[PDB]
């Protein structure tokens, strides 16, 4: 299914939903980046959301170390495919991953042509 | 300002936005009810949003007593008028008003066919 | 786990998340009602969200017929437990369930003390 | 009105709300960038939100040419100032502006520690 840099103990997952049709956003391209010491965004993982609008196996726990990560969702292409003119070029989610805090990260995005919401669910279990 | 009927100091205001068109939601019918002593909803005020997606002059400070109120937004008619089949029948906002002194309420609503967000901004008046 | 009127082929499910803590809202009371011909809301199913903030087995496909349903989420108690003063008395979701349209219904709610968003995901599979 | 610098007809405006307190988010730092010909972000304008959670006078109609712009909202500093540890580093809003004639843009933002919604309201000016 939807997987990126090695399907592992999904410590990071992306969920995308379409608020116009009331369905998950399928085949949306998602690019994850990590902030390098040179302070640039270097590629990390990427993929297309699945039938259920999810993206799993982006990374691994061993490779998912503390740092600033940027999740970029290609919303514009998504709306253009539907023949709908959007407002944003894409949607970004910038956050610092820490070790002390809970483990698994679920980033959710709800999309409309002129608006988008984003939530983080941080828990201890698999989700 | 006004007394016993319209926007005394507009203690109650409603603002609605369209997340599909990136515009204010115009001509949206709004009905306000107050919880009646006999535990039933009594019609309190009604109106439609203007060109700016706003609704003012619903009530007055003297008429806006303590109580539980219900702001009902006819979202369904709105999308239907636009050629879209929405999911909700309407959006309802229920809250206790003025129970520790009068305040000014702005009920904001962001609409999408299958989704809606509502937020309240509360102010302690000053003059 | 979290189940209401007979755990069946979950044609209706409730998902509730807390936007202040970045976690699912656990132990939230949810009451579903159906509009009766007398046009009153008669009880249908109810329960408390689980560890993951979900509520399943509310109803059955045979008993989940077309009609107007109201999902009521006790948000106020939820915030009061956390020692946080909320704005709404509760959150309601009013919608018409139809047969032609897709099958399974997932109602999602994202909560903040002064704001709440709600989405419907309507699909053909189990979710 | 103004030319070459501030709110000519306020072609660009930003409004931020706090979903935890039910109030405007005051003193939130905002940085605007424009995509530079060499594919990099060039500082375009900056400011802080007022008592009303608003930011006006960022640019002028003559200076607000066609281009891709990035509105960055320092949400992190905001919650930290409030004693809360947020999830996002900030909230970024990227869009193409004025590519088919000048328009007026109102970028709205609703904030919660672990969640944020952003909406745009676009107007074709008239005088």
From Swiss-Prot, chains A, B, C, D:
Impact reported for residue 77 to Y: In AMYLD1; amyloid polyneuropathy
Effect in UniProt of substituting residue 91 to S: In AMYLD1; amyloid polyneuropathy
Free-text tissue specificity from the UniProt record: Detected in serum and cerebrospinal fluid (at protein level). Highly expressed in choroid plexus epithelial cells. Detected in retina pigment epithelium and liver.
Effect seen on changing residue 114 to H: In CTS1; amyloid deposit on carpal tunnel; patients show no other abnormalities
Impact upon substituting residue 33 to I: In AMYLD1; Jewish 'SKO' amyloid polyneuropathy
Residue numbers bearing the Phosphoserine modification: 52
Effect caused by changing residue 97 to G: In AMYLD1; amyloid polyneuropathy
Effect noted on mutating residue 94 to A: In a patient with amyloidosis
Domain comment as written in the entry: Each monomer has two 4-stranded beta sheets and the shape of a prolate ellipsoid. Antiparallel beta-sheet interactions link monomers into dimers. A short loop from each monomer forms the main dimer-dimer interaction. These two pairs of loops separate the opposed, convex beta-sheets of the dimers to form an internal channel.
Protein name, as recorded: Transthyretin
Classification lineage: Eukaryota, Metazoa, Chordata, Craniata, Vertebrata
Gene: TTR
């Amino acid at each position: 299914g939807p997987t990126g840099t090695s399907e592992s103990k999904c410590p990071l997952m992306v969920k995308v939903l379409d608020a116009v049709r009331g369905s998950p956003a399928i085949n949306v391209a998602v690019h994850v980046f990590r902030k390098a010491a040179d302070d640039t965004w270097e590629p990390f993982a990427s993929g297309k959301t699945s039938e259920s609008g999810e993206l799993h196996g982006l990374t691994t726990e061993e490779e998912f170390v503390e740092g600033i990560y940027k999740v970029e969702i290609d919303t514009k292409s998504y709306w253009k495919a539907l023949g709908i003119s959007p407002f944003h070029e894409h949607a970004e989610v910038v956050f610092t991953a820490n070790d002390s805090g809970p483990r698994r990260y679920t980033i959710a995005a709800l999309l409309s042509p002129y608006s988008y919401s984003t939530t983080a669910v941080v828990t201890n279990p698999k989700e």
